[PDB]
Design a protein around this ligand. Structure first.
Ligand SMILES: CC(C)(C)c1ccc(N(C(=O)c2c[nH]cn2)[C@@H](C(=O)NC2CCCCC2)c2cccnc2)cc1
Ligand SMILES: CC(C)(C)c1ccc(N(C(=O)c2c[nH]cn2)[C@@H](C(=O)NC2CCCCC2)c2cccnc2)cc1
Lengths: 302, 300
């Protein structure tokens, strides 16, 4: 019983964190094989104005780097640009490199953040990529380079390196190929995130979990067609629903079909009437169907 | 900026999880030094009816245990009873045992849960001990023996070993000395948890975190004294405010006194759910002052 946002165990990722310092800038890097990957703004001089990163790298002084895993210091062999990241070739292989891949996540997908400071893991929590390509993180100064990851069958899938915080407090990263999520710039210029729409498929997964956990007061006798809901959704800050075959077994276990939940979402989007659903007082879109099925039943969909 | 319920990195505890099987029962244990600690109901026969744990232990055959760390099986050399736990002596020392202590937590305290199945960690998340001595976990069958703990300067402080789930879904465990939180029985019974209440000291911590993050729409322009709030609190599902010293550090940084936050709690309670605070239910009680200070300022 229960539904909690949770992270996968962080042990295999913890051994990949290093401290990367250039001059007076210090942040975190990921050490995999003989490469350290980190945000390129570690070589930015000052926080304003626009940075010519190509020029900065051209006048780089390699011995001005300090890269360490605990008190293991890594010598820098070379540095090249990789989008919004640096690829730093170092002189030692991380013998604790896990089996890993890179994958770029899409809005609505969940992953784990390993929040790091001074090159050491400090905390771990689950996040979900918003439609505006930001995440609801908790980071303070020094967390840049903190990685986001999933673990599938022993393979670490890296999908995020923390880059910056927008004025509203939402958090922006790049994928490990250096492509910034949402096209935000790694520059100090003013930029604002777009509006956030609730990922409706995730809201549906949450309401199914609510039913499985005995929360039913909110459920509607009505029902609304997918097509009609989608018309309403785009005027009410929620995404459209594409298809319901991922709710197949959830629909069977509870007896409630998507159309009934869609009508429930419409009533609950205003307010919860002073009531709560699993402790929430507004709809949450942070849980995917995969997370719900895993937490309800211990099945990992592939 | 931001506020999230965070777990500490779980690596040092992952290496201490083992699978403990006896008869038709399988759960998780904690392997520290040459001992494996697990709930004693692993030696109960079935779940249909009550059993005498002392009798169960008196006729136990050591070789009926199967205890494994990964694919490495441990020999069992002795077993004794420790409250609602077993202390199983094994024939190998865990070379990955961290520096560790035990401590029994109080209602309102936070700790980390490493949710485990078949002797291997599956997820990690923070919790907070409720006033009825339950936690709001996420567990399914086979999670028993999952540990709860805190990490302070590399020392692991174990405070919880998961024992059972109640009808309402809340979760019951024991401390590592075998003392069940809340006095619940490790028996198949009709027991139900006591009344739940919001932990007001944690709501105060959360509201300070909101202020630190620039959230002020809910801040009352007036104040209420603690004694008057405590009268109201016990009639509105909240705990009384007993210790105020823990908020000195947060008042010193926000310049907002506790009395003003108490008046804000009353107003939030009267329109419960009308607006979120930092993307949370306004009367969130899962964050402690310690958690807020760490996340806002990095201070240990
Ligand atoms: C150079 C550049 C791209 C402008 C920059 C500057 C600072 C940082 N921030 C580092 O904390 C940091 C810097 N170097 C090591 N850490 C922080 C940050 O984003 N403030 C923002 C201020 C407005 C516009 C620039 C970014 C930060 C804080 C909290 C959580 N996340 C990040 C990130 C990027
Ligand atoms: C023997 C005893 C004390 C009655 C018992 C029986 C079953 C378990 N539960 C095991 O899953 C389990 C048991 N052994 C290995 N796994 C589950 C459980 O609590 N059902 C309860 C049924 C009502 C009251 C008794 C316990 C469980 C589920 C989810 C999370 N936590 C635990 C726990 C304790």
């Amino acid at each position: 019983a229960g539904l909690r946002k949770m992270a996968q165990p962080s042990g295999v990722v913890e051994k990949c964190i290093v401290r990367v310092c250039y001059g007076n800038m210090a942040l975190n890097g990921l050490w995999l094989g003989d490469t350290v990957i980190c945000p390129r703004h570690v070589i930015a001089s000052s926080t304003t104005s626009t940075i010519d990163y190509d020029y900065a790298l051209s006048v780089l002084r390699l011995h001005n780097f300090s890269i360490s895993s605990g008190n293991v210091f890594l010598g820098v062999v070379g540095v090249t640009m990789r989008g919004a990241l640096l690829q730093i070739k170092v002189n030692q292989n991380n013998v604790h490199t896990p089996k890993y891949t890179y994958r770029t996540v899409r809005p609505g997908e969940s992953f784990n953040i390993l929040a790091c400071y001074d090159g050491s893991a400090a905390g771990v929590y689950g996040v979900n990529m918003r439609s505006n390509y930001t995440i609801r993180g908790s980071f303070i100064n020094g967390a840049c380079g903190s990685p986001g990851y999933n673990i599938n069958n022993g393979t670490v899938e890296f999908c995020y390196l923390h880059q910056l915080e927008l004025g509203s407090g939402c958090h922006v990263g790049s994928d490990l190929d250096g492509v910034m999520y949402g096209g935000y710039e790694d520059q100090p210029t003013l930029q604002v995130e777009g509006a956030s729409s609730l990922f409706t498929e995730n809201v549906l997964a949450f309401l199914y979990a609510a039913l499985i956990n005995g929360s039913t007061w909110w459920l509607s006798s009505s029902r609304i067609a997918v097509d009609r809901f989608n018309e309403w959704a785009v005027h009410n800050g929620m995404t459209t629903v594409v298809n319901t075959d991922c709710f197949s077994i959830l629909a069977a276990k509870t007896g409630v079909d998507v159309q009934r939940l869609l009508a429930s979402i419409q009533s609950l989007h205003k307010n919860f009437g002073g009531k709560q659903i699993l402790g929430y007082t507004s709809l949450t879109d942070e849980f995917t169907t995969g997370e719900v099925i895993r937490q309800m039943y211990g099945v990992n969909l592939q």
